[PDB]
From a paper:
Beta-38 is classified by serology and BLI competition mapping as requiring Lys-484. The Beta-38/Beta RBD complex structure confirms this, with the antibody attacking the neck/left shoulder region from the front, achieving specificity by burying Lys-484 between the H3 and L3 loops. The hydrophobic stem of the lysine side chain is contained within a hydrophobic cage composed of Phe-490 (RBD), Tyr-108 (HC), and Trp-92 (LC). At the end of the cage Asp-94 (LC) makes a salt bridge with the amino group of the lysine side chain of residue 484 and a hydrogen bond to Asn-32. There are two Fab-RBD complexes in the crystallographic asymmetric unit and the different crystal packing forces introduce a 13° difference in the angle of attack, indicating flexibility in the attachment of this highly focused antibody. (K) K484 is enclosed by the Beta-38 HC and LC CDR3s.
Alpha-B.1.1.7, Beta-B.1.351, Gamma-P.1, and Delta-B.1.617.2 variants of SARS-CoV-2 express multiple mutations in the spike protein (S). The RBD mutations found in Alpha (N501Y), Beta (K417N, E484K, and N501Y), Gamma (K417T, E484K, and N501Y), and Delta (L452R and T478K) are located in or closely adjacent to the ACE2-interacting surface where they have the potential to modulate ACE2 interaction or disrupt the binding of neutralizing mAbs. To understand this, we generated 674 mAbs from Beta-infected individuals and performed a detailed structure-function analysis of the 27 most potent mAbs: one binding the spike N-terminal domain (NTD), the rest the receptor-binding domain (RBD). A detailed structure-function analysis comprising 22 X-ray and cryo-EM structures is presented for 16 Fabs most in complexes with RBD or S, which allows an understanding of the changes in antigenicity of the Beta S protein.
Author numbering:
A (entry chain E): 333 to 526
B (entry chain L): 1 to 213
C (entry chain H): 1 to 141, 146 to 227
Write the structure that this text describes.
């Protein structure tokens, strides 16, 4: 019985930007969520359709591990039924989401003096994302009636903005690493247990 | 915060490596890539680096760019004589909604040893004074590389109004020359005890002083 | 290959209108922004603005909005930069350039990959004027520098010799300054041994052809 490779996902040295969020398929293995839930490091640990403490008792067919960085005050948008810049344009959970949302402050790793500009998010889009849809396009967003022709200006915005994380930011603006675990139960052997 | 700051000058011997910094802010380099342009004297600028570190066709691999956050750098390895030029960084700036050029860096490929300037300072002639005018003449020559800054002084106080300074120009021996002119009224010239012309060349400073006598 | 060709050098007076041009070749003229860049003498590059000839849209720098007009005529692949009333301060080199745009790794790309050869614009209200010539006496404090101040003349150039060309060793005639008045001034200095200041006469011969000026000024130590 091989252990769940949660280390590659939670302990990845770098995380994706939320607009290009990473997905890892987790199956085979059999790891325990008690230590994760009893960990003093995760500031958010919220589950839907399933109980975190009783996770060791349950078996599922597949697990998806999505990971990315957002700012602290956006963690509340990583939940079913939310709207806002992140839920609308970057990473959208379904209403019937079954899984857990885990986040922790990553200021020590992801902020730099003068700003870490590596992490981006999408501010504009012609429509809201469908659940688990991904958009990595970079066309100038034409908000107004003037064509942009690839240049910013009159109501013409580059769609991605850098978080520019600085260590002196308040915790609402500090970077948080997020792991979304989707517990899928289809018609297959339940190979992932606690 | 909408100016790309570059060092005024840089230099190296042939074969050496020179680096040129480009300092920006969140509104430009934070969300936009940096580019570099090379302008040989008397020629049009040309694209040297685009999108932080890409080279157009016809730009050798001796030029490499890098960008980290709000800072960027151009490196020239194995300096060759034809690399002597002005270099400008540039990027789109979101505060101004347009491209901005950096302040520019003059690169010199040292063909001879460094040379300090010769400074000659003349007071107003008696014949100009009788015409109710006064000009101090500060002549600067035999310096290399071709970059100087000039500061004028009344007694020991800075003077800025009425200063006219040439750009450095290459002289015969491939050293450089410049001249700086201070216009005064005869009353101003006769009020102070002395005027000074202070020339700075690569951290060194040469000062000459004249007095109304 | 892709090429931009600009119109010829311009000599104007303040208050006159001016339109300079930039013709593109070897590419789809309506598919790229084309822009203007100013370079004042001895100074750096300043972005002025751009036009997209496919639909005549423009973007102007805030420092140049309303001061100039950028236009284009796509049937003849030409972009323009226009002033309704020039100032002397408009004197500069002007380049046109083709823009390239896009994105790399989530960050916005904008660069100018093809450049015109440049157009010089010289705007002056100065009238032809001969110089006043003043001696630059050797100071009384093993070599000494004496010279001649050639002041307030227009246009360039002047010629300076010393002792009718008999003296050439040690002569340094410096390039002129352009004063904000529109007039030029220069100096010529000859460095001689201090021991000859009493026994050798020094006369600078200044010639300004446009004013038919010929001045010979003796330079003697100050009394
Ligand atoms: C990620 O790495 C950290 C550190 O290497 C692991 O945290 C350690 O976990 C053990 C028990 O599992 C504790 O005894 C240590 O005190 C922990 N160290 C720290 C610094 O927290 C963590 O288990 C790893 N997570 C995953 C999912 O592999
Ligand atoms: Cl393009």
């Amino acid at each position: 019985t091989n252990l769940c490779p949660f280390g590659e996902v939670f302990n990845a040295t770098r995380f994706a930007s939320v607009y290009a969020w990473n997905r890892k398929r987790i199956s085979n293995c059999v790891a325990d969520y008690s230590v994760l839930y009893n960990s003093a490091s995760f500031s958010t640990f919220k589950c839907y359709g399933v109980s975190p403490t009783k996770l060791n008792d349950l078996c599922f067919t597949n697990v998806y591990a999505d990971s990315f960085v957002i700012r602290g005050d956006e963690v509340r948008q990583i939940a079913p039924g939310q709207t806002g810049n992140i839920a609308d344009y970057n990473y959208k959970l379904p209403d019937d989401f079954t899984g857990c949302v885990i986040a922790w402050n990553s200021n020590n790793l992801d902020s730099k003096v003068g700003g870490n500009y590596n992490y981006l998010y999408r501010l504009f889009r012609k429509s809201n994302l469908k659940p688990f849809e991904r958009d990595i396009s970079t066309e100038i967003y034409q908000a107004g009636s003037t064509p942009c022709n690839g240049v910013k200006g009159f109501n013409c915005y580059f769609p991605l903005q850098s978080y520019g994380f600085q260590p002196t930011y308040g915790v609402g603006y500090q970077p948080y690493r997020v792991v979304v675990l989707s517990f899928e139960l289809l018609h297959a052997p339940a190979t992932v247990c606690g | 915060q909408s100016v790309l700051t570059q060092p005024p000058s840089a230099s190296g011997t042939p074969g050496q490596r020179v680096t040129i910094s480009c300092s920006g802010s969140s509104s430009n380099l934070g969300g936009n890539t940096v580019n570099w342009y090379q302008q040989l004297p008397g020629t049009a600028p040309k694209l040297l680096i685009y999108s932080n570190n890409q080279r157009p066709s016809g730009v050798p691999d001796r030029f490499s760019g890098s960008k980290s956050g709000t800072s960027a750098s151009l490196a020239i390895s194995g300096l060759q004589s034809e690399d002597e030029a002005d270099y400008y960084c540039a990027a789109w700036d979101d505060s101004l909604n347009g491209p901005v050029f950096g302040t520019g860096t003059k690169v010199t490929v040292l063909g001879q040893p460094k040379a300090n300037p010769t400074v000659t300072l003349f007071p107003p002639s008696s014949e100009e004074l009788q015409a109710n005018k006064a000009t101090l003449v500060c002549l600067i020559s035999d310096f290399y590389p071709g970059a100087v800054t000039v500061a004028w002084k009344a007694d020991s106080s800075p003077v800025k109004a009425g200063v006219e300074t040439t750009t450095p120009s290459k002289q015969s021996n491939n050293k450089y020359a410049a001249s700086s002119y201070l216009s005064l009224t005869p009353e101003q010239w006769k009020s102070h005890r002395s005027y000074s012309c202070q020339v700075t060349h690569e951290g060194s400073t040469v000062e000459k002083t004249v007095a109304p006598t | 290959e892709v090429q931009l060709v600009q119109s010829g050098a311009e000599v104007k007076k303040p208050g006159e209108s001016l339109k300079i041009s930039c013709k593109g070749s070897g590419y789809s003229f309506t598919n790229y922004w084309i822009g203007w860049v100013r370079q004042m003498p001895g100074k750096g590059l300043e972005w002025m603005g751009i036009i997209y000839p496919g639909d005549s849209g423009t973007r102007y720098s805030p420092s140049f909005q309303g001061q100039v007009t950028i236009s284009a005529d796509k049937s003849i692949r030409t972009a323009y930069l226009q002033w309704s009333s020039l100032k002397a301060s408009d004197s500069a080199m002007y380049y046109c350039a083709r823009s390239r745009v896009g994105a790399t790794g989530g960050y916005y790309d904008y660069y100018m990959d093809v450049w015109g050869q440049g157009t010089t614009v010289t705007v002056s209200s100065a009238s032809t004027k001969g110089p006043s010539v003043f001696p630059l006496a050797p100071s009384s404090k093993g070599t000494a520098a004496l010279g001649c101040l050639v002041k307030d003349y227009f246009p360039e150039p002047v010629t300076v010799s010393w002792n009718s060309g008999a003296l050439t060793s040690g002569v340094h005639t410096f390039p002129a300054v352009l004063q904000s008045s529109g007039l030029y001034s220069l100096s010529s200095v000859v460095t001689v041994p201090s021991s000859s200041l009493g026994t050798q006469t020094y006369i600078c011969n200044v010639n300004h052809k446009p004013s038919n000026t010929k001045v010979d000024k003796k330079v003697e130590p100050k009394s």
